[PDB]
Amino acid sequence: TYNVDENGYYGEFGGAYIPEILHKCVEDLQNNYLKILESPDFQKEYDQLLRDYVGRPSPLYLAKRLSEKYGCKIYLKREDLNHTGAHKINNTIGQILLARRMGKTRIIAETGAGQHGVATATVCALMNMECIVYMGKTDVERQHVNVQKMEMLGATVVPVTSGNMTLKDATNEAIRDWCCHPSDTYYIIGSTVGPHPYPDMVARLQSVISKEIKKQLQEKEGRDYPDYLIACVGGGSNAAGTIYHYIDDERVKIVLAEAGGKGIDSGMTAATIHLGKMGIIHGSKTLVMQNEDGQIEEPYSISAGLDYPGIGPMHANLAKQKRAQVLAINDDEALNAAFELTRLEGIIPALESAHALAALEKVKFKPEDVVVLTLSGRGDKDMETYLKYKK
Amino acid sequence: TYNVDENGYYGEFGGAYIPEILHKCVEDLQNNYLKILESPDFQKEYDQLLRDYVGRPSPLYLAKRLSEKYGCKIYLKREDLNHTGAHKINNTIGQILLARRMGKTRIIAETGAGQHGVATATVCALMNMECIVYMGKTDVERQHVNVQKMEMLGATVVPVTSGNMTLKDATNEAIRDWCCHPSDTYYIIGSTVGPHPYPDMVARLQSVISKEIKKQLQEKEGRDYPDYLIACVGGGSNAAGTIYHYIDDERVKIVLAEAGGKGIDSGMTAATIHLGKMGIIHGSKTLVMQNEDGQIEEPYSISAGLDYPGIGPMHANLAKQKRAQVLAINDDEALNAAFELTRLEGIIPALESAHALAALEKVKFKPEDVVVLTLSGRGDKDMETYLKY
């Protein structure tokens, strides 16, 4: 299987490469997570909140003008319509329910651009649970609306002033925090990253996407599988959910779009699958962009959501084994695709999602091909970028 | 009976108070709109787009922390989750579907704060149809993000410099364009305002809200009606939609929240039901805020979306007959309610919708009351205002 194996690995990638201090809390999570996620109590509450609070199922929308342009049937999986405007809310809802079932009361997370921090604070408001979000001080400074939303939602935002004051430092303080609070604290990881069981956990939470796609395609096409699944990747969570229930069925082609930034040869890029080497990042053995001194490098993308140096182990494995095609989509290609979707379907996509849309230009589709592309988010949050880069 | 009568009136209110130029285009719409709206072909495409493009049905969400706070069961009808972030998309989808079944190919609309202009441009992009939005130049200057959105969506934004250079003037110019274009043009009005049949048409399009509430209450509560419907009003479309299927059921109390601004006695207000006089606005007989010289006033609210001098005739009638309770909610009250919902439920409401939320402090609830409150929009667009408070 291309899902996780019984040891926490996706082929050679993944596992739990963690200091001894994390051994106990990660082991404890490993023991709990599947028992709770498979339980009917959990499934019932998760489904109810996903329906009433998030608004699931997200529609599967036949984009008729896009379909005309690319000469095939293109459905858009509309995660952009979720409460909070992206798929991250599926994961924060799932993990807060897990946390509660583990008897945890204090919820912590880190955030870079602010989206995961908002998704985390959102569910902590819902649940009336103490919420602390760690955020690199440089990230804090230039993400003031997200900081303000977190604070409105009643979370405490902790500016992280250690190291370079970036996402890496915030991640480090969050992990330290969790480790030091084995009694009461649960750490909500933001993507399909981190030590086992977090990658599998987050993929399972996001698998609601492909669960729905199966039902929706059956109703609309009379078959339960598309010819292509297309998603953007940062850490890999919306892609993991999109492909989860199709991951071993090679009839369904997988196209992953990563952030090329200014171009894979430009030195300002986030194309981890194309350019990364093996490394350990946040306890996971995976591909990581490293500089000539072996140091975890500084990625660049127009989209903050995709400018992570690592990739989830799932996708490293999919790419190596050639189960998925991976494209490095550049900033200009993503912007062009965002403006195109806006004009053709009246949907303003997230800049992340726009990388996936740009992939449509790169693949020669057949007229009977059925493509499902995950519109991971809406583009309201990106409007300042869109106004600056327009025309 | 509280819905439109056979002549376009709601008691004495409504009708079509128009010059001769308009008579042709308005009569045409009056004669044809309802048979299209009621037709299976229309209903099938409307439902398909509402499901797959907008994400309907919008959930009915039991807000447990809000419910515990006010001592009863408060369901939020989640129009905030729709594509575009509000209920206006229900109206633009419905009306462009009508326009197409009428053979019209050029689409025009007015907008104030920009939300209707966005919702119109949105569906014209989908449908690949020419779109022109009239917008007061003051509003163009106040709403740079919405203007740029409309342009990204393919629409032409026409700055209107007549009158006060705001919503009433843009409405005036849209109407005037329409009348000059008998061949090819359909005018998507943005609220339950204007000449018959626009009030009734928009209310019917928005009635999907209450059609859903019925099924959703049946499933959740066993009965299909609440004790209260609570909604905010500008022109009155989300409210009309919310009440449409309940409007003659006296068991259902209706509470409409209007924008008090800095207070009804402040000089800076938008509380049309409380302060308006009978008069004509945009070919509709209704309540209209007027200066002492009898001209249409510039309203004020912290929420730009409630900058309506007039109100839909439906609501003038509901208020005069005491079928609805009407509350004038001040800026402060709306702001506190927005912060309250954000903290209690993790939902950042539109400032328009926050006026309905603030009505929760004002109503004496019984423990076994079931309230449905229409969360007309999300509040992403309002974060710069919330930051300041």
JSON list of C-alpha atoms in Angstrom, two decimals, chain A residues 51-55 59-61 65 78 81 83 122 125-126 128 144-145 148-149 152-153 220 342-348 378 380 383-384 387 390, chain B residues 51-55 59 61 65 78 81 83 122 125-126 128 145 148-149 151-154 220 339 342-346 348 378 380 383-384 386-387:
[
{"chain": "A", "resi": 51, "resn": "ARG", "atom": "CA", "xyz": [-21.91, 18.57, 8.33]},
{"chain": "A", "resi": 52, "resn": "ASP", "atom": "CA", "xyz": [-23.35, 21.33, 10.51]},
{"chain": "A", "resi": 53, "resn": "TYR", "atom": "CA", "xyz": [-20.30, 23.41, 11.33]},
{"chain": "A", "resi": 54, "resn": "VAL", "atom": "CA", "xyz": [-18.04, 22.99, 8.29]},
{"chain": "A", "resi": 55, "resn": "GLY", "atom": "CA", "xyz": [-20.84, 22.46, 5.71]},
{"chain": "A", "resi": 59, "resn": "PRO", "atom": "CA", "xyz": [-19.62, 20.06, -3.65]},
{"chain": "A", "resi": 60, "resn": "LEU", "atom": "CA", "xyz": [-18.13, 18.43, -6.68]},
{"chain": "A", "resi": 61, "resn": "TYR", "atom": "CA", "xyz": [-18.58, 21.13, -9.30]},
{"chain": "A", "resi": 65, "resn": "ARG", "atom": "CA", "xyz": [-15.80, 26.61, -19.15]},
{"chain": "A", "resi": 78, "resn": "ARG", "atom": "CA", "xyz": [-14.90, 22.64, -3.49]},
{"chain": "A", "resi": 81, "resn": "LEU", "atom": "CA", "xyz": [-16.54, 26.53, 0.46]},
{"chain": "A", "resi": 83, "resn": "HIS", "atom": "CA", "xyz": [-16.05, 27.07, 7.02]},
{"chain": "A", "resi": 122, "resn": "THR", "atom": "CA", "xyz": [-11.47, 28.32, 15.37]},
{"chain": "A", "resi": 125, "resn": "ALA", "atom": "CA", "xyz": [-13.42, 28.58, 20.29]},
{"chain": "A", "resi": 126, "resn": "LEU", "atom": "CA", "xyz": [-16.14, 26.07, 19.29]},
{"chain": "A", "resi": 128, "resn": "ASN", "atom": "CA", "xyz": [-14.21, 26.24, 24.75]},
{"chain": "A", "resi": 144, "resn": "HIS", "atom": "CA", "xyz": [-1.56, 40.92, 11.27]},
{"chain": "A", "resi": 145, "resn": "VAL", "atom": "CA", "xyz": [-5.10, 39.94, 10.15]},
{"chain": "A", "resi": 148, "resn": "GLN", "atom": "CA", "xyz": [-6.01, 39.44, 14.94]},
{"chain": "A", "resi": 149, "resn": "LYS", "atom": "CA", "xyz": [-8.37, 36.58, 14.00]},
{"chain": "A", "resi": 152, "resn": "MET", "atom": "CA", "xyz": [-10.56, 37.31, 18.42]},
{"chain": "A", "resi": 153, "resn": "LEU", "atom": "CA", "xyz": [-11.06, 33.55, 18.57]},
{"chain": "A", "resi": 220, "resn": "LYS", "atom": "CA", "xyz": [-22.65, 12.22, -11.56]},
{"chain": "A", "resi": 342, "resn": "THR", "atom": "CA", "xyz": [-11.82, 33.78, -11.72]},
{"chain": "A", "resi": 343, "resn": "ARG", "atom": "CA", "xyz": [-12.72, 34.80, -15.28]},
{"chain": "A", "resi": 344, "resn": "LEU", "atom": "CA", "xyz": [-14.03, 31.39, -16.43]},
{"chain": "A", "resi": 345, "resn": "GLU", "atom": "CA", "xyz": [-15.97, 30.13, -13.41]},
{"chain": "A", "resi": 346, "resn": "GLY", "atom": "CA", "xyz": [-16.38, 33.09, -11.06]},
{"chain": "A", "resi": 347, "resn": "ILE", "atom": "CA", "xyz": [-14.28, 31.33, -8.39]},
{"chain": "A", "resi": 348, "resn": "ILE", "atom": "CA", "xyz": [-11.31, 33.18, -6.88]},
{"chain": "A", "resi": 378, "resn": "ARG", "atom": "CA", "xyz": [-10.65, 30.33, -1.52]},
{"chain": "A", "resi": 380, "resn": "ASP", "atom": "CA", "xyz": [-10.09, 36.15, -0.27]},
{"chain": "A", "resi": 383, "resn": "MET", "atom": "CA", "xyz": [-6.60, 39.50, -2.61]},
{"chain": "A", "resi": 384, "resn": "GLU", "atom": "CA", "xyz": [-3.78, 41.92, -1.78]},
{"chain": "A", "resi": 387, "resn": "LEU", "atom": "CA", "xyz": [-4.35, 43.28, -6.75]},
{"chain": "A", "resi": 390, "resn": "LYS", "atom": "CA", "xyz": [-2.94, 41.84, -11.69]},
{"chain": "B", "resi": 51, "resn": "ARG", "atom": "CA", "xyz": [-25.99, 22.57, -4.86]},
{"chain": "B", "resi": 52, "resn": "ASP", "atom": "CA", "xyz": [-22.80, 22.25, -6.86]},
{"chain": "B", "resi": 53, "resn": "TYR", "atom": "CA", "xyz": [-21.67, 25.88, -7.30]},
{"chain": "B", "resi": 54, "resn": "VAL", "atom": "CA", "xyz": [-22.91, 27.56, -4.06]},
{"chain": "B", "resi": 55, "resn": "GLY", "atom": "CA", "xyz": [-22.73, 24.58, -1.63]},
{"chain": "B", "resi": 59, "resn": "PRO", "atom": "CA", "xyz": [-26.21, 24.16, 7.24]},
{"chain": "B", "resi": 61, "resn": "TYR", "atom": "CA", "xyz": [-25.96, 24.89, 12.95]},
{"chain": "B", "resi": 65, "resn": "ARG", "atom": "CA", "xyz": [-22.21, 28.07, 23.39]},
{"chain": "B", "resi": 78, "resn": "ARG", "atom": "CA", "xyz": [-25.27, 29.48, 7.64]},
{"chain": "B", "resi": 81, "resn": "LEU", "atom": "CA", "xyz": [-20.74, 29.43, 4.04]},
{"chain": "B", "resi": 83, "resn": "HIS", "atom": "CA", "xyz": [-19.90, 30.69, -2.42]},
{"chain": "B", "resi": 122, "resn": "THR", "atom": "CA", "xyz": [-19.55, 36.10, -10.40]},
{"chain": "B", "resi": 125, "resn": "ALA", "atom": "CA", "xyz": [-18.29, 34.97, -15.42]},
{"chain": "B", "resi": 126, "resn": "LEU", "atom": "CA", "xyz": [-19.78, 31.47, -14.96]},
{"chain": "B", "resi": 128, "resn": "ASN", "atom": "CA", "xyz": [-19.85, 33.95, -20.08]},
{"chain": "B", "resi": 145, "resn": "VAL", "atom": "CA", "xyz": [-11.13, 45.29, -3.05]},
{"chain": "B", "resi": 148, "resn": "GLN", "atom": "CA", "xyz": [-10.85, 44.90, -8.23]},
{"chain": "B", "resi": 149, "resn": "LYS", "atom": "CA", "xyz": [-12.76, 41.62, -7.68]},
{"chain": "B", "resi": 151, "resn": "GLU", "atom": "CA", "xyz": [-12.71, 43.52, -12.74]},
{"chain": "B", "resi": 152, "resn": "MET", "atom": "CA", "xyz": [-10.95, 40.19, -12.15]},
{"chain": "B", "resi": 153, "resn": "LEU", "atom": "CA", "xyz": [-14.37, 38.54, -12.78]},
{"chain": "B", "resi": 154, "resn": "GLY", "atom": "CA", "xyz": [-14.60, 40.24, -16.16]},
{"chain": "B", "resi": 220, "resn": "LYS", "atom": "CA", "xyz": [-33.34, 18.28, 14.08]},
{"chain": "B", "resi": 339, "resn": "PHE", "atom": "CA", "xyz": [-16.86, 39.61, 18.84]},
{"chain": "B", "resi": 342, "resn": "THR", "atom": "CA", "xyz": [-16.28, 34.83, 17.11]},
{"chain": "B", "resi": 343, "resn": "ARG", "atom": "CA", "xyz": [-15.31, 33.89, 20.65]},
{"chain": "B", "resi": 344, "resn": "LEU", "atom": "CA", "xyz": [-18.22, 31.52, 21.40]},
{"chain": "B", "resi": 345, "resn": "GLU", "atom": "CA", "xyz": [-18.55, 29.64, 18.12]},
{"chain": "B", "resi": 346, "resn": "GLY", "atom": "CA", "xyz": [-15.40, 30.39, 16.05]},
{"chain": "B", "resi": 348, "resn": "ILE", "atom": "CA", "xyz": [-16.61, 35.62, 12.30]},
{"chain": "B", "resi": 378, "resn": "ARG", "atom": "CA", "xyz": [-19.07, 35.95, 6.89]},
{"chain": "B", "resi": 380, "resn": "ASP", "atom": "CA", "xyz": [-13.59, 38.34, 6.56]},
{"chain": "B", "resi": 383, "resn": "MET", "atom": "CA", "xyz": [-11.70, 42.51, 9.74]},
{"chain": "B", "resi": 384, "resn": "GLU", "atom": "CA", "xyz": [-10.25, 46.01, 9.24]},
{"chain": "B", "resi": 386, "resn": "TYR", "atom": "CA", "xyz": [-13.04, 44.82, 13.86]},
{"chain": "B", "resi": 387, "resn": "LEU", "atom": "CA", "xyz": [-9.31, 45.58, 14.27]}
]
